[PDB]
Design a protein around this ligand. Structure first.
Ligand code: KE8
Length: 332
């Protein structure tokens, strides 16, 4: 971990496929920080995702979205093998927290509020995160929450969202909206809302709500709780392979949320229901979720900011863009 004299005394924290996140002590400001060693320069896709994330986190400024404090890299493209991204150290993440801690209703409420407040800003930028999950939600010692990991994020593209049945998808399986498996590329804001719905359900029980073990088992987990889709919702799936697959399944009845979650607040289950709607057109949006009765103690739209400037949208060209996009952190 080659992070210069600014970042002394290191540790051992998190990991990815094309990089790794750990911890060290900062000297220009006098605090411990998080640092992630990214080495993506062998693959086009991973270069694209290092670049997506850098460009987004540098444009974004919001209290519930992780920032970049520094980027450490070689002075020349030639000498640049690794990129080190420095961020505020966060005590934990919601994944780690859910495996060890019962959350009070008051924590659940506050966490959901902050996730939606961060997500309001993201979506106001015309950006989709596309991989929200407990391990991408960071928490400090006083339960302040920041959204991290924008490597699968995209500019929204609802006019190009349609695809065939069983189209491969990249984002984490347990948090995938049912339409992903049926007819959606995940190019609409509704995809993030479904994930948030899943995270909420998981905060209520400490257990993932739809833990599918493979691509199509994911859908059948979803339908086991929501029940069979209605005729109207089925008529919105025009793709015949997808429609006929749903028609081939035995009828399933809705599992009521209060049987699944008998200790949960009844307003939290009302919001859950609206986040985990099968039909993405009927699914609650982020600003309506913030306005829901469950969040009324926190709701303040003048204190839930939006982005000033939204977005509009090979490996050798991408290294040069990564080089150009990290130039501001260099000495000189
Ligand atoms: C102590 N503690 N415990 C939990 C979380 C933390 N503190 C903490 N503070 C600040 C930032 C972070 C993280 C950032 C990122 C994290 S944690 C992950 C989720 C690993 N990630 C993706 C990495 N990519 C995946 C694809 O290949 C390339 C690498 C980040 O960008 N964490």
């Amino acid at each position: 971990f080659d992070v210069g004299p600014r970042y002394t005394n290191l540790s051992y924290i998190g990991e990815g496929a094309y990089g790794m996140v750990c911890s060290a002590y900062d000297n220009v400001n006098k605090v411990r920080v998080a640092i992630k060693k990214i080495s993506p320069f062998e693959h086009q896709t991973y270069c694209q995702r290092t670049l997506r994330e850098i460009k987004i986190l540098l444009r974004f400024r919001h209290e519930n979205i992780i920032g970049i404090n520094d980027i450490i890299r070689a002075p020349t493209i030639e000498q640049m093998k690794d990129v080190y991204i420095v961020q505020d150290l966060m005590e934990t993440d919601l994944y780690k927290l859910l495996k060890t801690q019962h959350l009070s209703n008051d924590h659940i409420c506050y966490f959901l509020y902050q996730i939606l407040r961060g997500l309001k800003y993201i979506h106001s930028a015309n950006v989709l995160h596309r991989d929200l999950k407990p391990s991408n939600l960071l928490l400090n010692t006083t339960c302040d929450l920041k959204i991290c990991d924008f490597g699968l994020a995209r500019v929204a593209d609802p006019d190009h969202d349609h695809t065939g049945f069983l189209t491969e998808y990249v984002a984490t399986r347990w948090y995938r909206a049912p339409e992903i498996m049926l007819n959606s590329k995940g190019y609409t804001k509704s995809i993030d809302i479904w994930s948030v719905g899943c995270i909420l359900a998981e905060m209520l029980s400490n257990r993932p709500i739809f833990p599918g073990k493979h691509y199509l088992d994911q859908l059948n987990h979803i339908l086991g709780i929501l029940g069979s889709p209605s005729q109207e919702d089925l008529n919105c799936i025009i793709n015949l392979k997808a429609r006929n697959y749903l028609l081939s399944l035995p009828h399933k009845n809705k599992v009521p949320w209060n049987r699944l979650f008998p200790n949960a607040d009844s307003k939290a289950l009302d919001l859950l229901d609206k986040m985990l709607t099968f039909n993405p057109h009927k699914r609650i949006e982020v600003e309506q979720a913030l306005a829901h009765p469950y969040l009324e103690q926190y709701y303040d739209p003048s204190d839930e900011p939006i982005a000033e400037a939204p977005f509009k949208f090979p490996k050798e060209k991408l290294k040069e863009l990564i080089f150009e996009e990290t130039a501001r952190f260099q000495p000189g």
